[PDB]
Write a protein that holds these residues in place. Structure first.
Motif, PDB file in Angstrom:
ATOM      1  N   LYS A 250       2.387   1.726  -3.494  1.00 31.38           N
ATOM      2  CA  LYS A 250       1.380   2.209  -4.433  1.00 31.38           C
ATOM      3  C   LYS A 250       1.061   3.680  -4.188  1.00 31.38           C
ATOM      4  O   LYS A 250       0.932   4.464  -5.137  1.00 31.38           O
ATOM      5  CB  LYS A 250       0.125   1.340  -4.341  1.00 31.38           C
ATOM      6  CG  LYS A 250      -1.093   1.900  -5.049  1.00 31.38           C
ATOM      7  CD  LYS A 250      -2.292   0.991  -4.836  1.00 31.38           C
ATOM      8  CE  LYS A 250      -2.574   0.781  -3.358  1.00 31.38           C
ATOM      9  NZ  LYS A 250      -3.639  -0.236  -3.137  1.00 31.38           N
ATOM     10  N   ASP A 251       0.945   4.081  -2.918  1.00 31.45           N
ATOM     11  CA  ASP A 251       0.695   5.485  -2.610  1.00 31.45           C
ATOM     12  C   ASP A 251       1.878   6.363  -3.003  1.00 31.45           C
ATOM     13  O   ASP A 251       1.688   7.501  -3.436  1.00 31.45           O
ATOM     14  CB  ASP A 251       0.365   5.653  -1.127  1.00 31.45           C
ATOM     15  CG  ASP A 251      -1.074   5.297  -0.809  1.00 31.45           C
ATOM     16  OD1 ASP A 251      -1.851   5.053  -1.758  1.00 31.45           O
ATOM     17  OD2 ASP A 251      -1.431   5.265   0.387  1.00 31.45           O
TER      18      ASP A 251
ATOM     19  N   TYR B 295       1.749  13.234  -8.879  1.00 27.45           N
ATOM     20  CA  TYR B 295       1.126  14.509  -8.554  1.00 27.45           C
ATOM     21  C   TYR B 295       2.028  15.666  -8.966  1.00 27.45           C
ATOM     22  O   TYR B 295       3.198  15.722  -8.575  1.00 27.45           O
ATOM     23  CB  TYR B 295       0.834  14.587  -7.057  1.00 27.45           C
ATOM     24  CG  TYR B 295      -0.362  13.783  -6.602  1.00 27.45           C
ATOM     25  CD1 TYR B 295      -1.239  13.217  -7.518  1.00 27.45           C
ATOM     26  CD2 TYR B 295      -0.616  13.599  -5.250  1.00 27.45           C
ATOM     27  CE1 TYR B 295      -2.335  12.486  -7.096  1.00 27.45           C
ATOM     28  CE2 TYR B 295      -1.705  12.872  -4.820  1.00 27.45           C
ATOM     29  CZ  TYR B 295      -2.561  12.318  -5.744  1.00 27.45           C
ATOM     30  OH  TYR B 295      -3.645  11.595  -5.305  1.00 27.45           O
ATOM     31  N   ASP B 296       1.472  16.592  -9.751  1.00 23.65           N
ATOM     32  CA  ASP B 296       2.151  17.836 -10.123  1.00 23.65           C
ATOM     33  C   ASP B 296       3.521  17.565 -10.742  1.00 23.65           C
ATOM     34  O   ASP B 296       4.476  18.321 -10.549  1.00 23.65           O
ATOM     35  CB  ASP B 296       2.276  18.775  -8.921  1.00 23.65           C
ATOM     36  CG  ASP B 296       0.929  19.182  -8.358  1.00 23.65           C
ATOM     37  OD1 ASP B 296      -0.104  18.754  -8.916  1.00 23.65           O
ATOM     38  OD2 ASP B 296       0.903  19.929  -7.357  1.00 23.65           O
TER      39      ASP B 296
ATOM     40  N   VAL C  40       3.916   5.762  -5.546  1.00 27.80           N
ATOM     41  CA  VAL C  40       3.785   5.880  -6.997  1.00 27.80           C
ATOM     42  C   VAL C  40       2.728   6.922  -7.345  1.00 27.80           C
ATOM     43  O   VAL C  40       2.927   7.768  -8.226  1.00 27.80           O
ATOM     44  CB  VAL C  40       3.458   4.511  -7.622  1.00 27.80           C
ATOM     45  CG1 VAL C  40       3.086   4.669  -9.088  1.00 27.80           C
ATOM     46  CG2 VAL C  40       4.638   3.566  -7.472  1.00 27.80           C
ATOM     47  N   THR C  41       1.586   6.872  -6.656  1.00 28.22           N
ATOM     48  CA  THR C  41       0.510   7.829  -6.910  1.00 28.22           C
ATOM     49  C   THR C  41       0.965   9.262  -6.641  1.00 28.22           C
ATOM     50  O   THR C  41       0.761  10.157  -7.469  1.00 28.22           O
ATOM     51  CB  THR C  41      -0.709   7.484  -6.053  1.00 28.22           C
ATOM     52  OG1 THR C  41      -1.200   6.187  -6.415  1.00 28.22           O
ATOM     53  CG2 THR C  41      -1.812   8.511  -6.254  1.00 28.22           C
ATOM     54  N   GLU C  42       1.590   9.496  -5.485  1.00 30.39           N
ATOM     55  CA  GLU C  42       2.019  10.838  -5.105  1.00 30.39           C
ATOM     56  C   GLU C  42       3.182  11.342  -5.949  1.00 30.39           C
ATOM     57  O   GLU C  42       3.402  12.557  -6.009  1.00 30.39           O
ATOM     58  CB  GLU C  42       2.413  10.871  -3.625  1.00 30.39           C
ATOM     59  CG  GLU C  42       1.314  10.458  -2.654  1.00 30.39           C
ATOM     60  CD  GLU C  42       0.545  11.638  -2.092  1.00 30.39           C
ATOM     61  OE1 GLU C  42       0.866  12.789  -2.453  1.00 30.39           O
ATOM     62  OE2 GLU C  42      -0.380  11.412  -1.282  1.00 30.39           O
TER      63      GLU C  42
ATOM     64  N   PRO D 101       5.096  16.568 -14.552  1.00 31.04           N
ATOM     65  CA  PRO D 101       4.939  16.223 -15.971  1.00 31.04           C
ATOM     66  C   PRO D 101       5.960  15.213 -16.459  1.00 31.04           C
ATOM     67  O   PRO D 101       5.759  14.619 -17.527  1.00 31.04           O
ATOM     68  CB  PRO D 101       5.118  17.573 -16.678  1.00 31.04           C
ATOM     69  CG  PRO D 101       6.052  18.321 -15.781  1.00 31.04           C
ATOM     70  CD  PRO D 101       5.733  17.885 -14.368  1.00 31.04           C
TER      71      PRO D 101
ATOM     72  N   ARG E 240       0.825  -1.204   0.000  1.00 29.33           N
ATOM     73  CA  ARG E 240       0.000   0.000   0.000  1.00 29.33           C
ATOM     74  C   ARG E 240       0.861   1.256   0.000  1.00 29.33           C
ATOM     75  O   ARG E 240       0.569   2.220  -0.718  1.00 29.33           O
ATOM     76  CB  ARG E 240      -0.935  -0.003   1.209  1.00 29.33           C
ATOM     77  CG  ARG E 240      -2.378  -0.358   0.893  1.00 29.33           C
ATOM     78  CD  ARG E 240      -3.255  -0.300   2.141  1.00 29.33           C
ATOM     79  NE  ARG E 240      -3.183   0.992   2.814  1.00 29.33           N
ATOM     80  CZ  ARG E 240      -2.507   1.220   3.932  1.00 29.33           C
ATOM     81  NH1 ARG E 240      -1.833   0.258   4.541  1.00 29.33           N
ATOM     82  NH2 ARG E 240      -2.504   2.445   4.451  1.00 29.33           N
TER      83      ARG E 240
END
Lengths: 233, 142
Positions: free
Chosen positions: A68-69, A76-77, A71-73, A79, A65
């Motif tokens: 995965k978080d 964020y913002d 990777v998600t964060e 490119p 978990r």
């Protein structure tokens, strides 16, 4: 976690000229009972990192978990999440080791041994280890649990020093990993025949082979072993 | 009967309005244009970035922000308030995923953002958000 319950046995890994290989079985052991068959203990991060986790399965899911978080964060913002700012293996290992050391110093650790294996952006092979105590070390061959005692000496025969890394090929390293997995299935009571294997190559990328099995098992010599010594028949 | 009802947030004028909210709406009207279009199996967001000077690096200073891995958000008005709002939305989505494992539904995320913005209109100690936000994405219901 104060006392581990459901546990994973071992994770083995070794460097080679163009990257790293890692492997771990698919077994969840309830102490002395092999309760859960088919549990993936290798977690891929991005396309260039694999984290092998042995030990408490609940803490392994927590680390899944967290990865995965992360990777998600990272998306964020950003490119350049696809490249030039993607998650590198070194970043992931540093985060994981900091988490492990913090949870150690709070007297509530994650009962796991983690091996981070991947290829950096510049092609360098990254292979590092961390545990519930926060100890971090790097070696061309890295294994946890029984693999640290049995699988390590075999793999080190392939790569005994850093000079041997360019000489070792992907085929030799994969054969050594499979042989070490067979030896572990031989001599580890808390091991399984099914295992998964990840190859992080600086050219072909991430190869993830699941449902692999141990084959070519020498057991015939068992028929000629009769008695505890004195017994003839 | 009276005057000065527009000097404090969450204060009701005799008609029944919140003039600070409408002043924030005036602030968003001054902002640049941003649109969202719902298609059959997804959504599309678009925004106009005013080239104040040609010294600005093109393709940078992005305006659309990603929440979780399936939510897009754009806003018109005070860009920093939009960044604050998307940060709070990311926190809400992280909590939802941590407790429920499934990525946050779009109606749930919308209601979270709405409750946050509404609570920002309940106290004279906080200023209403100076952005209008067009967001959304795809979930199990479409």
């Amino acid at each position: 976690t104060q006392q581990p319950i459901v546990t994973g046995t071992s994770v083995i890994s070794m460097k080679y000229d163009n990257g790293v290989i890692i492997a771990a079985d698919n077994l969840g052991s309830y102490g002395s009972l092999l309760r859960f068959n088919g549990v993936e203990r290798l977690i891929p991060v991005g396309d260039n990192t694999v984290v092998g986790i042995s030990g408490d399965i609940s803490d392994m899911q927590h680390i899944e978990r967290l990865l995965k978080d992360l990777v998600t964060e990272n998306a964020y913002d950003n490119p350049l999440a696809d490249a030039e700012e993607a998650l590198e293996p070194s970043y992931i290992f540093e985060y994981l080791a900091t988490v492990m050391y913090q949870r150690r110093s709070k007297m509530n650790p994650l009962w796991n041994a983690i091996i981070v294996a991947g290829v950096q952006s510049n092609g360098d092979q990254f292979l590092r280890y961390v545990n519930l105590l926060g100890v971090t070390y790097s070696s061309p061959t890295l294994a946890t649990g029984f693999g640290a005692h049995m699988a390590n000496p075999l793999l080190r025969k392939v790569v005994d020093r850093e000079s041997d890394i360019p000489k070792t090929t992907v085929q030799v390293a994969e054969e050594a990993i499979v042989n070490a997995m067979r030896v572990l299935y031989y001599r580890d009571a808390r091991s399984s025949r099914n295992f998964s294997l990840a190859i992080i190559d600086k050219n072909t990328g991430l190869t993830f082979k699941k449902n692999l099995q141990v084959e070519n098992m020498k057991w015939d010599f068992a028929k000629d072993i009769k008695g505890y010594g004195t017994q003839k028949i | 009967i009276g005057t000065g009802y527009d000097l404090s947030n969450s204060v009701f004028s005799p008609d029944g309005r919140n003039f600070q909210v409408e002043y924030a709406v005036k602030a968003v009207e001054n902002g640049t244009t941003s649109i969202g279009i719902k298609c059959n199996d997804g959504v599309v967001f678009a925004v106009e970035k005013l080239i104040t000077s040609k010294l600005l690096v093109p393709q940078k200073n992005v305006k659309i922000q990603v929440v979780d891995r399936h939510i897009g958000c754009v806003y018109s008005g005070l860009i920093p308030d939009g960044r604050h709002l998307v940060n709070r939305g990311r926190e809400e989505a992280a909590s939802f995923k941590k407790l429920y494992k499934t990525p946050i539904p779009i109606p749930a995320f919308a209601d979270r953002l709405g409750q946050y913005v509404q609570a920002h209109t309940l106290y004279n100690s906080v200023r209403p958000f100076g952005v209008s936000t067009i967001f959304g994405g795809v979930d199990k219901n479409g």
